[PDB]
């Protein structure tokens, strides 16, 4: 339910997430928790997509009435989600209440010391923290995947006769318990939970519902750490209780378990692809010579490669659509490493000689600039990898320290509008600077469109800066770093010919 | 209250943490929460010290009686602490209940994709997560410190006249509120908490106690992110309440705030050292023409470098003492990057010719080894940087795939014991292999001591393997990786002359 806004005046990706309730008191008092979680999920997905797609704006309609950002705030859950996604929120996020809408300006994710290339809401990779199954964070998932990639995946020793207790004792006891044909009710186990043992108690009515939900994460955790045994039908005090069911119910539960396990995504770094080796068994529980219920014992063998509970929760924007990254793409991102100067001189001279009014217009525009660089091109759209527009005479990019980059479009057609072309070119330039260029600061690109009359009259048809508003951080840019990022982006785009004079 | 155990037979650092209650039920039912937290802190400090000092063993006396590791477990809080310290607990930790003691075998911390060189319980660096002050994790602290080190530390722009609301509005409103000479009781604020605003309500009796405790972390968070304003004396609904106090109480509170702020550690990456720029003000609250109480407003300016709430909580073992890393050392670690083969041939030939029984003893010992490498030295203690023992004839290190490394000490003195020398040499060798060598797997070093009689009689005085027990993971080692780590350690120790023949 996230759509790219094509009617916006901003020269960047604007994602509309629909009506969102804002304010700490307003969000904490929302009666419908499902709606609040859905709004949080939509905002988080939009933020992740913008982080992975070169930055942009999240536009949310303010659902609650009489909302003031200064007086109310944002909301604890949204802030917690932002903190989970981003280590330093002020470095990436800006908030602005514009009329009835809330704008979250999101900077592109930049490679840092952590080594992460993309942002993930949840890697859906689980591990065993001695007794608990926890979803690997970005750093843990990165380390796990790189270690498995490097190694293409992943008897007894004589010891002194000393009476010791280890996790191997619990694993052996659980294995012996697994092979028991029948069980006795109200008997205590000789083992407890460990890296290879998990014990859960579920009601009969909720068992089928929870098998589709919690079993995948425990199976992923076991297959990722060392394998293990999951026992369902034992209470907190390790007493055998079980759940009452019929043979048909047992068959249906076994089928559901098989479907849930086979649905789990699996990525292999080895040459020999393998399935998840699991064994499901049902042990009858006998009380006073009568069958009380059944205990479900699931043995999950150690897996050679990554096992996912669900597809990794990473998003991006492609073809003006918010798409979740496929497992292969996510794995590839995780494991695979990465005065005024008028240039070029020849093109500037040709443009100034062919069109006399263009030079006067450039001088008038640049009289207000303290120091900067102006780069001319026949079509800046082509240099960014987009389609050429033959009606545009030329494009000019201005990089100055006191102002954000400005793209100057010039056209000879009086009755045609070039707002969309210039906006798309500026959006692509910003994305290339952020991702390919390597610029690590907040950057926005403004546009100015001019009509060059044959008699030399110049008029400013469109001025982007006077129609859109940004946080102040976007209005101050580092000229040297901008030039370096532009040089790197042009070099990587195979469109660097004479933009920088050496 | 953590001491290095010098009476242990293990050839590694054994840290005794005293009596520790173990078991999930036992620990969750502990009446004294202070004692439980103290035990958890001691175990965590010992684990961090062992991780930073080349690995070792944590020995804890089992306080509770009738404790079985297989039946009871470890404890939720201890497991959570271990998970916080280590991304993958099974990769580093092994647990063993030996008699009345509990042994935690800890592998040395190895450099990984995260870039961390040491482990920290808490960096004590705080940041602002929009409304909350949170302690930077290891990755966040690493990124923050490296960014500040790289840059040697760390007007208005014209915008369209659009009615918008940002965090700057809240900051300006808080600044205006800061300069007010007097306040009126039961009036609502025009701003709320943000990246630059924190609002807390404290009782009069607990105000002095909490100033020494919670003020440093908020001051650190403000000085680390963007500065801000802290307001004490306002309830949840942003109504001005204040706290009743006298002028002497105000002076004492101001002195306590000054002492607390000046006590905070500060590290500077810039040339010009600066103090924490803060301003403390007390605003009277007037109700019906009478003074009700006072509101404390603290303005913390943005700081140029790192501000610590406390010294970073990182530990190591030096001179057989568990010492907390100093701030300078912690900063330096964070920000600054890093058949049977008989060698050497000449020394082996000389030893075999001088002592005939030595060759026979070596052959008898190596007849049981499938494949490995034996390296002889005049004194392996010298090659590891320790003091030479002239009574020891020679030392031999055996590296095999089926067995852990074994150090063979040979002596001609019948009435003297060399257990301590061999144990210290093995401990130093293990530490050098783990840290300097770069070995990333669990490794233990056994020792065997032999007496070479002048007539050629050989006797095994001490055999370490038969007297100590390790988890099975320590009994299987990678021979090629062990040789590579040994080569790297010898090269970095300037003691590599002819150990490996090329
Ligand atoms: Zn595989
Ligand atoms: Zn400084």
Residue numbers in the entry:
A (entry chain A), B (entry chain B): 2 to 155, 162 to 345, 387 to 550
The article reads:
DNMDP and related compounds, or velcrins, induce complex formation between the phosphodiesterase PDE3A and the SLFN12 protein, leading to a cytotoxic response in cancer cells that express elevated levels of both proteins. PDE3A is a well-characterized cyclic nucleotide phosphodiesterase (PDE) that hydrolyzes cAMP, cGMP, and cUMP8,9. Here, we show that PDE3A and SLFN12 form a heterotetramer stabilized by binding of DNMDP. Moreover, we demonstrate that SLFN12 is an RNase, that PDE3A binding increases SLFN12 RNase activity, and that SLFN12 RNase activity is required for DNMDP response.
The dynamic motion of the two bodies necessitated refinement of each protein dimer separately utilizing the multi-body refinement approach in RELION25, with the final resolution for the maps for SLFN12 and PDE3ACAT being 2.76 and 2.97 Å, respectively. Residues 1–560 of each monomer of SLFN12 could be modeled, with the first 346 residues being guided by the structure of rat SLFN13 and residues 387–560 built de novo. The regions between 346 and 386 and beyond residue 561 were not visible in the maps, suggesting that they adopted multiple conformations. The structure of the SLFN12 monomers can be divided into an NTD and C-terminal domain (CTD), which comprise residues 1–345 and 387–560, respectively. The SLFN12-NTD can be further sub-divided into an N-lobe, C-lobe, and two bridging domains (BDs). The overall structure of the SLFN12-NTD is very similar to the rat SLFN13-NTD, with an RMSD of main chain atoms of 0.55 and 0.75 Å for the individual N-lobes and C-lobes, respectively. The SLFN12-CTD is comprised of a core domain between residues 387–541 and the PDE3A interacting region (PIR), between residues 551 and 560. The two SLFN12 monomers interact over the length of the NTD and a small portion of the CTD. The interactions are centered around four residues from each monomer: T71, F89, I131, and I517. The side chains of these four amino acids are inserted into hydrophobic pockets formed by residues from the opposite monomer.
